[PDB]
Amino acid sequence: IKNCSFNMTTELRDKNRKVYSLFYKLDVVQINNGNNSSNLYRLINCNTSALTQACPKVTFEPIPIRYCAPAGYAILKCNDKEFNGTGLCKNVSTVQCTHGIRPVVSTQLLLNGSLAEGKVMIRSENITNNVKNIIVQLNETVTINCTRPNNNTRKSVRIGPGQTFYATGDIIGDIRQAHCNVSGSQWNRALHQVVGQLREYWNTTIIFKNSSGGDLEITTHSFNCGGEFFYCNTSGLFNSNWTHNDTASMKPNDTITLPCRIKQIINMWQRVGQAIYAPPIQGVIRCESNITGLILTRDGGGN
Amino acid sequence: IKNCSFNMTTELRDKNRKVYSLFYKLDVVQINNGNNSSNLYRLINCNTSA
Amino acid sequence: QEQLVESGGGVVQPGGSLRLSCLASGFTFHKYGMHWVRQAPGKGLEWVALISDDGMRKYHSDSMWGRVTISRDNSKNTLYLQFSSLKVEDTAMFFCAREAGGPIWHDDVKYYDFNDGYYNYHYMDVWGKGTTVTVSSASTKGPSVFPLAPSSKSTSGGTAALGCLVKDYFPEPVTVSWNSGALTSGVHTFPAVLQSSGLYSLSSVVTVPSSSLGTQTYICNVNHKPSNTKVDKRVEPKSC
Amino acid sequence: QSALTQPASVSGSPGQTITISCNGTSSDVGGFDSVSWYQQSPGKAPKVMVFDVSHRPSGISNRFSGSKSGNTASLTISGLHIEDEGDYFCSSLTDRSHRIFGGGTKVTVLGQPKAAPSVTLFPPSSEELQANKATLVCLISDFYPGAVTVAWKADSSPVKAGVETTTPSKQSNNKYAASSYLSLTPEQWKSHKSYSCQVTHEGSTVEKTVAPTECS
Ligand SMILES: *[C@@H]1O[C@H](CO)[C@@H](O[C@@H]2O[C@H](CO)[C@@H](O[C@@H]3O[C@H](CO[C@H]4O[C@H](CO[C@H]5O[C@H](CO)[C@@H](O)[C@H](O)[C@@H]5O)[C@@H](O)[C@H](O[C@H]5O[C@H](CO)[C@@H](O)[C@H](O)[C@@H]5O)[C@@H]4O)[C@@H](O)[C@H](O[C@H]4O[C@H](CO)[C@@H](O)[C@H](O)[C@@H]4O)[C@@H]3O)[C@H](O)[C@H]2NC(C)=O)[C@H](O)[C@H]1NC(C)=O
Ligand SMILES: *[C@@H]1O[C@H](CO)[C@@H](O[C@@H]2O[C@H](CO)[C@@H](O[C@@H]3O[C@H](CO[C@H]4O[C@H](CO)[C@@H](O)[C@H](O)[C@@H]4O)[C@@H](O)[C@H](O[C@H]4O[C@H](CO)[C@@H](O)[C@H](O)[C@@H]4O)[C@@H]3O)[C@H](O)[C@H]2NC(C)=O)[C@H](O)[C@H]1NC(C)=O
Ligand SMILES: *[C@@H]1O[C@H](CO)[C@@H](O[C@@H]2O[C@H](CO)[C@@H](O[C@@H]3O[C@H](CO[C@H]4O[C@H](CO)[C@@H](O)[C@H](O)[C@@H]4O)[C@@H](O)[C@H](O[C@H]4O[C@H](CO)[C@@H](O)[C@H](O)[C@@H]4O)[C@@H]3O)[C@H](O)[C@H]2NC(C)=O)[C@H](O)[C@H]1NC(C)=O
Ligand SMILES: *[C@@H]1O[C@H](CO[C@@H]2O[C@@H](C)[C@@H](O)[C@@H](O)[C@@H]2O)[C@@H](O[C@@H]2O[C@H](CO)[C@@H](O[C@@H]3O[C@H](CO)[C@@H](O)[C@H](O)[C@@H]3O)[C@H](O)[C@H]2NC(C)=O)[C@H](O)[C@H]1NC(C)=O
Ligand SMILES: *[C@@H]1O[C@H](CO)[C@@H](O[C@@H]2O[C@H](CO)[C@@H](O[C@@H]3O[C@H](CO)[C@@H](O)[C@H](O)[C@@H]3O)[C@H](O)[C@H]2NC(C)=O)[C@H](O)[C@H]1NC(C)=O
Ligand SMILES: *[C@@H]1O[C@H](CO)[C@@H](O[C@@H]2O[C@H](CO)[C@@H](O[C@@H]3O[C@H](CO)[C@@H](O)[C@H](O)[C@@H]3O)[C@H](O)[C@H]2NC(C)=O)[C@H](O)[C@H]1NC(C)=O
Ligand SMILES: *[C@@H]1O[C@H](CO)[C@@H](O[C@@H]2O[C@H](CO)[C@@H](O)[C@H](O)[C@H]2NC(C)=O)[C@H](O)[C@H]1NC(C)=O
Ligand SMILES: *[C@@H]1O[C@H](CO)[C@@H](O[C@@H]2O[C@H](CO)[C@@H](O)[C@H](O)[C@H]2NC(C)=O)[C@H](O)[C@H]1NC(C)=O
Ligand SMILES: *[C@@H]1O[C@H](CO)[C@@H](O[C@@H]2O[C@H](CO)[C@@H](O)[C@H](O)[C@H]2NC(C)=O)[C@H](O)[C@H]1NC(C)=O
Ligand SMILES: *[C@@H]1O[C@H](CO)[C@@H](O)[C@H](O)[C@H]1NC(C)=O
Ligand SMILES: *[C@@H]1O[C@H](CO)[C@@H](O)[C@H](O)[C@H]1NC(C)=O
Ligand SMILES: *[C@@H]1O[C@H](CO)[C@@H](O)[C@H](O)[C@H]1NC(C)=O
Ligand SMILES: *[C@@H]1O[C@H](CO)[C@@H](O)[C@H](O)[C@H]1NC(C)=O
Ligand SMILES: *[C@@H]1O[C@H](CO)[C@@H](O)[C@H](O)[C@H]1NC(C)=O
Ligand SMILES: *[C@@H]1O[C@H](CO)[C@@H](O)[C@H](O)[C@H]1NC(C)=O
Ligand SMILES: *[C@@H]1O[C@H](CO)[C@@H](O)[C@H](O)[C@H]1NC(C)=O
Ligand SMILES: *[C@@H]1O[C@H](CO)[C@@H](O)[C@H](O)[C@H]1NC(C)=O
Ligand SMILES: *[C@@H]1O[C@H](CO)[C@@H](O)[C@H](O)[C@H]1NC(C)=O
Ligand SMILES: *[C@@H]1O[C@H](CO)[C@@H](O)[C@H](O)[C@H]1NC(C)=O
Ligand SMILES: *[C@@H]1O[C@H](CO)[C@@H](O)[C@H](O)[C@H]1NC(C)=O
Ligand SMILES: *[C@@H]1O[C@H](CO)[C@@H](O)[C@H](O)[C@H]1NC(C)=O
Ligand SMILES: *[C@@H]1O[C@H](CO)[C@@H](O)[C@H](O)[C@H]1NC(C)=O
Ligand SMILES: *[C@@H]1O[C@H](CO)[C@@H](O)[C@H](O)[C@H]1NC(C)=O
């Protein structure tokens, strides 16, 4: 967290005025090309692509969506829980407009999506292909409280002929970092069900390990909440091995606390072009989240 | 009824030039309130719109 | 025009305090800084102090630093200086000057401060009217007045000079006329010099032809307004 | 503390170009490039002459060009005008964000012939002898510019004590006048055979001698 000044322009040409706002470390980078820092930083979305706002009045929270069919074509939905991503199904339903969907941006997990009752399901395009993704459908959900307790401020300052920037002003009081919290016991039960379903060909061999590293859009669990792009970390999960005795690890019921990060910019669908900006949310930032899914990748660099 | 000079851009970005035209008082308003000594003005719609 | 005015100055006493105020009009004082400076008689300038607009910073000369305190009044659009332990070294005229406008020009582009603020560390495009300040421990006393006999400016031709010595008085100024302002030409009252005892001494002198002595009457009228004293003294050939 | 040093007085004829030159230090002139020059005349408020040295200030003629070298500054001027007579003070911004001015530089227009000062001396008048106080008034008049060093002397000895000098003041003829005061006693006044007031104007020099004249 840094408080940062720079110049801006009025609607006129020559009129320029200084102004200050707040920025994180994710948005900018230090110019180490010089002798030292010397308070010298630069936006990365700037020096890779162009820049624009994201219509701050248009907040980026989801809506129940339903996809409808044209004339002469229809939708067919299988009504079997354990029916995996392919194959033959009998319990059919013909439809004109899809069930209510919440198509939310989420990495490594699902959010507020449809559930898979009855049993837990695990699929992949080619499970024998280690590089393929392992899509998951849980039986139940979990209350996920990812939240920043610090209120946001806004400075709606005109720049152009009606063009205004919503700068993240100074925050009130002692400014702690964000965080996120999750239940332990229901989480361990869902883990028990998952590891009970993991035995595709084995009796006891299962391990989880965190990602080796890479793009932060893929290296953690990101999503959108009240407009802000939250990245709530995934580290309380990989430290889990229900290999030999499942009930052995049903005991450590612990309120799972973790640091959840945030973000303002995005290049959706990994298209490296003109990025966008996210405004403040003014007021403390809660985020409820259910859970209905998960995604993994197998370890090809191992036995 | 007044007439005003002001800068504008030349087709060369490094070059600008002062040009002058005529305007009324309805489309502008006084600013920098040294209340009456050759006060400068600003358009009514530019400070809020394009 | 950014026309500024001083107030509070004058003859004052040592040891106390002095509220030197500075108002102005013709502009917006909301975001303008101000310099206080002084200069003594027969001596140049010496920076007294400076203050910014938004009460953020303020700078004092190490000589006057601590002895004085600057302050501002945004709603009144006023600057103020509070003295402490007033001293005779403060005898000077004080000027209240402005800053070199707000913006800075680069590529014919005018950059400004935060909150559209006027800022510089530069020259002073305007200077106040000025105010005299006379710190002095002495007590206001009237003048001892005497005549100054005909001194022949030249041996030949018969041209003398007469005078009226107004000594042991304080504070300035003093009027010295001849027959209640009748004889107006030739007189030139010189600035008063602060005597060693805190008093003052001048001589209203006038050159005339030496033939005018005696034949032309002279009754020099001296008047001191601070003490409200008025005296008469004739100038004549020194008998000794 | 050390003001930007420059000569307290300068002179030059109208039209003839001149150049003022003031000194500085590493703290202010060697520390930054914001060296300014102000001017102030008798009976006039101060006004600037240079800021942003190699570019000139508001509304001033195109003849006054500033320059700077190391810790010293200077200002060359062409077409010497008459109204520009007065003191000049260069200023520089210290490293501690404080400023400091110079000593001053009085510009005097040559072409006005410097007349010798008409020095005369009033001794203690008869009204002051019995008052236990003697006073000698040395009047200087009709001298230009206002720069005269006063000195008092006895008939044979120098008398620096008791001297109180009045600064020059512009006479009606555009020359100057002044009045110096030597404070003595009637005993010291009469026991001494005579007294003298010697005044050093620009280069020519003048003096008056008074004696006790016993009259009716
Ligand atoms: C259209 O665009 C032009 C281009 O900018 C713009 O010009 C400005 O107009 C404002 C209007 O008031 C001017 O403000 C006045 O300036 C008067 C003189 O200004 C001098 O200073 C300029 C800035 O100098 C600094 O910056 C440059 C880099 O930009 C740097 O090199 C310098 O060293 C210095 O740091 C300077 O650029 C400018 O130069 C011109 O003139 C010189 C000759 O002097 C010539 O050689 C150059 O080639 C060039 O043509 C100029 O010298 C000044 O008199 C005036 O002061 C009085 O008024 C104020 C009230 O505003 C009072 O408060 C004050 O007490 C005085 O009474 C005031 O400061 C500004 O200087 C102009 N700047 C420039 C760069 O031109 C026009 O305004 C635009 N049109 C409109 C309608 O706005
Ligand atoms: C937008 O802004 C800048 C300015 O050009 C560029 O951003 C990236 O800049 C870095 C270095 O300036 C590019 O290279 C990477 O540097 C990382 C850190 O710097 C070290 O290495 C450089 C030499 O490359 C040294 O000079 C420097 O002192 C540091 O020692 C390196 O870590 C990178 O290598 C590896 O590091 C990561 C993290 O450990 C590993 O995970 C990776 O395997 C990686 O290989 C790398 O050398 C970087 O390429 C620049 N980004 C991009 C996208 O190019 C951008 O270039 C600029 N935008 C545009 C469009 O140019
Ligand atoms: C965007 O916003 C940033 C931050 O708000 C601005 O950064 C500063 O901007 C100001 C003015 O806009 C700069 O001010 C200048 O600083 C220079 C410092 O360099 C000197 O410093 C020392 C002492 O001299 C030396 O070691 C060094 O070598 C340099 O000598 C000065 O040089 C400038 O002074 C000159 O111009 C003034 C006019 O103001 C003249 O009167 C002087 O005589 C002198 O010639 C001036 O003071 C400041 O430097 C900027 N910061 C930094 C870190 O550089 C950006 O300016 C702003 N950009 C835009 C486009 O708005
Ligand atoms: C980082 O922030 C500091 C501190 O600024 C203060 O704290 C912030 C968290 C915000 O709440 C700001 O609103 C707040 O001012 C900046 O340094 C300087 O702070 C002082 C505060 O004392 C600013 O002074 C202001 O001056 C105006 C004008 O008169 C007053 O009306 C205000 O009441 C206030 O006192 C000062 O402007 C500010 N410095 C500058 C150059 O503006 C610091 O600047 C900032 N970081 C950067 C890179 O600018
Ligand atoms: C999944 O669904 C739940 C419940 O529908 C979503 O919970 C939402 O949580 C946010 C903040 O935690 C709530 O935001 C509030 O919005 C009002 C609107 O005026 C605002 O005034 C409040 O200050 C606060 O910001 C939101 O109301 C709440 N419920 C919703 C949107 O129905 C949850 O966000 C969903 N999951 C995801 C990933 O969005
Ligand atoms: C203001 O600054 C200038 C520039 O420094 C001063 O002028 C220069 O003064 C120095 C010594 O103070 C001179 O150095 C000596 O000069 C003589 C000249 O014959 C030379 O023989 C010596 O070897 C030595 O170099 C320097 O010459 C002189 N500059 C010029 C052009 O003559 C100036 O005195 C300063 N003014 C004040 C009032 O301090
Ligand atoms: C996964 O966890 C490993 C450690 O368990 C992280 O790697 C460590 O990162 C720290 C950071 O400074 C280093 O000091 C260690 O040496 C690293 N250890 C190893 C074994 O790599 C890694 O960053 C984590 N990755 C993610 C995506 O969370
Ligand atoms: C306002 O209009 C007058 C019209 O006269 C402008 O002055 C003229 O400027 C042209 C341009 O070279 C000259 O040829 C004329 O001789 C000028 N006439 C007069 C009477 O001055 C003036 O410049 C305009 N001012 C503004 C601010 O637009
Ligand atoms: C900026 O634009 C707004 C757009 O409405 C102006 O709003 C009003 O302008 C009139 C014009 O005189 C004023 O009488 C009103 O008081 C303004 N409204 C308000 C709420 O103050 C506004 O005046 C423009 N800015 C300035 C400085 O005039
Ligand atoms: C940093 O500065 C030092 C001395 O100024 C120099 O020796 C060194 O090479 C510099 N390092 C850089 C430019 O990376
Ligand atoms: C098939 O769908 C019907 C809906 O009419 C439902 O009642 C039934 O339980 C479903 N059976 C299975 C096995 O999905
Ligand atoms: C998916 O289900 C079908 C029938 O339900 C089964 O034949 C197939 O083997 C399943 N997929 C995998 C990868 O086992
Ligand atoms: C999310 O979980 C809550 C539990 O309080 C439930 O009421 C809600 O219906 C769930 N939303 C879904 C599954 O979309
Ligand atoms: C939880 O999952 C297990 C196995 O995956 C399943 O037996 C159980 O019915 C699920 N819980 C429900 C549907 O409430
Ligand atoms: C999965 O990929 C492997 C290649 O390692 C291939 O042998 C196998 O046939 C593939 N299976 C499916 C179902 O595509
Ligand atoms: C600051 O945060 C608190 C959270 O308790 C909130 O109640 C308050 O409204 C916030 N301040 C604002 C929005 O100015
Ligand atoms: C735990 O979760 C609760 C639920 O919202 C939250 O208020 C709290 O900040 C979290 N963190 C803790 C208890 O450290
Ligand atoms: C799970 O991890 C722990 C420590 O991270 C390790 O001691 C344990 O052996 C692991 N479980 C398996 C089955 O390898
Ligand atoms: C499978 O593993 C479990 C331990 O997790 C064990 O209790 C059970 O007997 C094993 N089943 C076999 C080897 O058929
Ligand atoms: C799991 O526990 C059971 C009984 O507690 C035991 O028989 C079995 O061996 C354990 N699993 C393994 C892999 O040893
Ligand atoms: C976890 O909860 C179970 C009951 O739900 C209890 O038997 C067990 O002791 C608990 N373990 C811990 C570490 O709290
Ligand atoms: C936070 O946790 C508990 C439930 O586990 C409760 O305070 C609330 O329902 C949760 N809120 C969320 C997930 O937004
Ligand atoms: C407003 O105009 C009046 C009349 O010309 C003037 O006296 C006053 O100073 C002006 N206001 C300001 C803030 O200068």
Contact in structure between D49 and D57 (CB atoms under 8 Å): yes
Q: What one-character-per-residue DSSP string does D39-73 give?
A: EE-TTS--EEEESSTTS--TT--TT-EEEEETTEE
Contact in structure between C207 and D141 (CB atoms under 8 Å): yes
Cβ within 8 Å of residue A110, ≥6 positions away:
A291, A292, A293, A294
For residues D186 and C239, give the distance between their C-alpha atoms in angstroms, rounded to a whole number.
14
Query: Which residue, by CA, sits nearest to atom 7 of ligand 5?
Result: A288
Q: Could you tell me the resolution of this structure in angstroms?
A: 4.6
Cβ within 8 Å of residue C152, ≥6 positions away:
C158, C159, C160, C210, D120
Which amino acid does the sequence have at C161?
A
Quick one: which of A152, A182, A185, A161 has its CA closest to A262?
A152
With tokens 């008791």, the residue in question is: D162
Cβ within 8 Å of residue C181, ≥6 positions away:
C221
Chain D residues closer than 8 Å to C127 by CB: 45-47
Q: Which atom of ligand 3 is nearest to the CA of A39?
A: 53
Q: Which atom of ligand 20 is nearest to the CA of A244?
A: 13
Inform me whether the C-beta atom of residue A14 falls under 8 Å from chain B C-beta atoms.
yes
SS3 A192: helix
* Nearest chain A Cα distance for residue C54, angstroms: 16
User: Separation of D21 CA from ligand 6 center, angstroms?
Assistant: 11
H/E run at residue D187: helix D186-191
* Nearest chain B Cα distance for residue A281, angstroms: 24
Say if the Cβ atoms of C240 and D212 lie within 8 Å.
Answer: yes
- D partners (3+ CB pairs within 8 A) are C
User: Separation of A34 CA from ligand 2 center, angstroms?
Assistant: 15
For residues C7 and C21, give the distance between their C-alpha atoms in angstroms, rounded to a whole number.
5
Our measurement of the distance from residue D146's CA atom to the centroid of its chain's CA atoms, rounded to an integer in Å, reads 6
Longest alpha-carbon distance in chain A: 74
Chain C residues closer than 8 Å to B7 by CB: 108
CA-CA distances (angstroms) from residue A49 to A44, A269, A272, C7?
Answer: 8, 15, 8, 60
Residue B49 Ramachandran class (φ > 0 left, ψ -120 to 50 alpha, else beta): beta
Strand partners, C222: C176, C231
Quick one: which of D180, D176, D130, D132 has its CA closest to D159?
D180
Inform me whether the C-beta atom of residue C114 falls under 8 Å from chain A C-beta atoms.
yes
Pairing between strand D106-109 and D9-12? parallel
For residues D133 and D122, give the distance between their C-alpha atoms in angstroms, rounded to a whole number.
14
Longest alpha-carbon distance in chain B: 37
Q: Where is chain D discontinuous (C–N over 2.5 Å), named by the preceding residue?
A: none
Q: What is the dihedral of CA C5, C10, C13, C15, to 10 degrees?
A: 20
Strand partners, A30: A41
Chain A residues closer than 8 Å to B19 by CB: none
For residues A62 and A112, give the distance between their C-alpha atoms in angstroms, rounded to a whole number.
10
Which of A263-268's residues contact partners 24+ apart within 8 Å by CB, and which partners? A263/A24, A263/A26, A263/A222, A263/A228, A263/A229, A263/A230, A263/A231, A264/A24, A264/A26, A264/A27, A264/A228, A264/A229, A265/A26, A265/A27, A265/A45, A265/A229, A266/A229, A267/A45, A267/A49, A268/A105
Peptide bond into D14 cis (omega under 30): no
With tokens 């709530």, the residue in question is: A232
Task: Please tell me the number of Cα atoms within 13 Å of A46 on its side-chain side.
Answer: 7
Q: How many CB atoms lie within 10 A of CB A101?
A: 15
User: Token pair for residue D19?
Assistant: 């150049």
Count of residues making up chain A: 303
Strand partners, C165: C146, C203
Q: How many CB atoms lie within 10 A of CB C156?
A: 6
- Alpha-helical segments (H) within chain A: 44-48, 185-197, 216-219
Cβ contact B–C (≥3 pairs, < 8 Å): yes
Q: What is the dihedral of CA D196, D202, D204, D208, to 10 degrees?
A: -20
SS3 C178: strand
Say if the Cβ atoms of B47 and A11 lie within 8 Å.
Answer: yes
Say if the Cβ atoms of C238 and D135 lie within 8 Å.
Answer: no
Quick one: which of D213, D210, D194 has its CA closest to D119?
D210
Q: Is D70 exposed, middle or buried (0-12, 13-18, 19+ CB in 10 A)?
A: exposed
Which of C53-57's residues contact partners 24+ apart within 8 Å by CB, and which partners? C53/C117, C53/C118, C54/C117
Say if the Cβ atoms of C111 and A18 lie within 8 Å.
Answer: yes
Contact in structure between D145 and D169 (CB atoms under 8 Å): no
Query: Which residue, by CA, sits nearest to atom 5 of ligand 15?
Result: A129
Q: Which atom of ligand 21 is nearest to the CA of A250?
A: 1
Strand partners, A22: A3
For residues D64 and D79, give the distance between their C-alpha atoms in angstroms, rounded to a whole number.
9
For residues C102 and C123, give the distance between their C-alpha atoms in angstroms, rounded to a whole number.
12
A86 lines ligand 15 (CB under 6 A): no
First to last CA, chain C: 61
Question: With b meaning 16 or more CB within 10 Å and e meaning fewer, what string describes C130-142?
Answer: bbebbbbebeebb
Contact in structure between D192 and D155 (CB atoms under 8 Å): yes
DSSP-derived letter for residue D176 is E
Which amino acid does the sequence have at C44?
G
Q: Where is chain C discontinuous (C–N over 2.5 Å), named by the preceding residue?
A: none
* Nearest C-alpha in B relative to C108: B16
